[PDB]
Automatic annotation (TrEMBL), chain A:
The gene is HA. Binds to sialic acid-containing receptors on the cell surface, bringing about the attachment of the virus particle to the cell. This attachment induces virion internalization of about two third of the virus particles through clathrin-dependent endocytosis and about one third through a clathrin- and caveolin-independent pathway. Plays a major role in the determination of host range restriction and virulence. Class I viral fusion protein. Binds to sialic acid-containing receptors on the cell surface, bringing about the attachment of the virus particle to the cell. This attachment induces virion internalization either through clathrin-dependent endocytosis or through clathrin- and caveolin-independent pathway. Plays a major role in the determination of host range restriction and virulence. Class I viral fusion protein. Responsible for penetration of the virus into the cell cytoplasm by mediating the fusion of the membrane of the endocytosed virus particle with the endosomal membrane. The chain holds residues 69 to 119 of 566 of the full protein. It is found in: Host apical cell membrane; Virion membrane. In natural infection, inactive HA is matured into HA1 and HA2 outside the cell by one or more trypsin-like, arginine-specific endoprotease secreted by the bronchial epithelial cells. One identified protease that may be involved in this process is secreted in lungs by club cells. Palmitoylated. Disulfide bonds join C12-C24. Belongs to the influenza viruses hemagglutinin family. Homotrimer of disulfide-linked HA1-HA2. Glycans are attached at N11. This is Hemagglutinin. It comes from Influenza A virus (A/Perth/16/2009(H3N2)).
């Protein structure tokens, strides 16, 4: 963890957390030096596609 | 994006084409053209299907094809832009629609545009070809209201 | 003031994801220090809540 701020996505992706998937609502209003995305990340909300 | 399709097919290194049997009920299959002469007969692209009106009736096409095999599939589809409006009435029997191909992730929407263009091989009309890659779990769906150069297989 | 982004809704059935055939496309717009975000919509608008 030290000395770089690490935020673990757990069951979340950065775009999903930005949009506000319910499961990701924990990461709201948080900052990071390095964001970590897990492979098991899944979305639980309206089908979203981002060009 | 011609360069992307060219590089993709070249990197894959196979032109293997597995033919598939879609619904295609209510529309006339095959299709012919004067410029695409094959064995002294008017014809079209071997891996593409020119759908045309049937009994002056073009139903909305909602045709679904899944992948149950364990390999990624490449589908080649197209939109026909007619040179003239007379031709649109003759070939598709309705007004210009929207062609939308869709999978779980990717969705492409193309609108036919009818206008005259510099004639090539005495053909004023044009066809725009797009590619869609379907994953194993994913399925392919098309909403055609006309002007669709449909795939024959993958 | 700097740029315009126009998107036309496309209504059609699409493969079911989480038992939801409809979809939502997400786009981003950057607003410079003195600038105005003007949104013209007659329908099908998923709208922002803040910045
Ligand atoms: C290839 O594509 C074809 C589609 O072209 C597809 O077959 C279709 O399958 C769906 C799903 O079952 C069928 O939809 C059902 O429709 C039932 C009502 O059918 C009536 O209306 C049909 C359309 O008529 C139009 O055109 C006439 C003029 O020709 C016009 O007057 C009408 O007003 C209308 O505009 C008509 O074809 C049909 O006649 C057939 O009826 C039966 C088959 O249903 C049989 O006797 C014959 O085959 C006859 O030709 C009839 O007049 C409706 O009852 C049904 O709704 C129930 O089921 C759904 C789904 O479970 C439930 O959600 C719902 O609540 C109801 O319980 C359903 O909506 C469609 O009619 C088929 N099309 C046909 C048969 O042509 C094939 O599967 C595709 N094949 C492959 C391999 O992919
Ligand atoms: C364009 O084409 C597409 C074709 O996909 C149409 O959209 C869908 O069509 C399918 C085919 O009928 C509909 O499938 C529905 O599945 C639902 C159940 O979800 C799944 O649940 C479990 C868990 O994964 C799966 O194992 C299961 O197999 C299901 O796939 C149900 O709504 C229906 O399933 C059946 O449920 C009960 C129990 O068997 C039956 O009694 C019902 O009669 C029903 O048959 C259904 O089969 C799906 O609903 C369609 N999507 C919709 C309606 O949004 C488009 O409609 C078409 N566009 C048009 C016509 O405009
Ligand atoms: C892909 O996207 C397209 C475009 O949205 C969809 O295709 C069709 O879209 C039209 C949009 O208007 C659908 O709606 C209308 O259907 C009406 C039903 O007519 C029925 O009439 C009697 C009942 O009294 C039935 O017995 C008969 O069989 C018909 O089914 C028509 O009235 C409509 O035409 C008129 O619409 C308005 C109404 O005032 C006027 O501007 C005009 O008078 C116009 O002529 C129109 O056809 C239509 O149902 C859609 N088709 C289908 C098969 O659903 C596809 O649905 C979509 N594909 C998907 C979602 O898979
Ligand atoms: C428009 O006309 C075409 C025919 O040009 C037709 O599409 C064909 O439909 C048939 C039947 O569904 C498909 O099956 C073929 O039938 C022919 C009959 O002559 C056979 O010779 C084929 O076998 C050869 O081709 C295979 C695929 O390359 C080879 O693996 C095999 O070894 C043989 O060489 C095959 O059984 C056929 O694939 C299509 N396509 C073509 C180009 O034939 C279509 O149905 C017609 N449309 C309408 C509305 O009538
Ligand atoms: C994340 O996924 C795991 C899968 O084993 C599950 O047990 C856990 O409850 C999930 N966490 C959240 C917050 O959904």
């Amino acid at each position: 963890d030290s000395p770089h701020q690490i935020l673990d996505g757990k069951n979340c992706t950065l775009i999903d957390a930005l949009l506000g998937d319910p499961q990701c609502d924990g990461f709201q209003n948080k900052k990071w030096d390095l964001f970590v995305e897990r492979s098991k990340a899944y979305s639980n909300c309206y089908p979203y596609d981002v060009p | 994006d011609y360069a992307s399709l060219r590089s993709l097919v070249a990197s894959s290194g196979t032109l293997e084409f597995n033919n598939e049997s879609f619904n295609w009920t209510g529309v006339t299959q095959n299709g012919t053209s004067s410029a695409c002469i094959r064995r002294s007969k008017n014809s079209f692209f071997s891996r593409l299907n020119w759908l045309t009106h049937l009994n002056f009736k073009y139903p909305a096409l909602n045709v679904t094809m899944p992948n149950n095999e364990q390999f990624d599939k490449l589908y080649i589809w197209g939109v026909h832009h007619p040179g003239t409006d007379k031709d649109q009435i003759f070939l598709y029997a309705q007004a210009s629609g929207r062609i939308t191909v869709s999978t779980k992730r990717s969705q492409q929407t193309v609108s036919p545009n009818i206008g005259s263009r510099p004639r090539v091989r005495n053909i004023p009309s044009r066809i725009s070809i797009y590619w869609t890659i379907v994953k194993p779990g994913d399925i392919l769906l098309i909403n055609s209201t006309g002007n669709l150069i449909a795939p024959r297989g993958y």
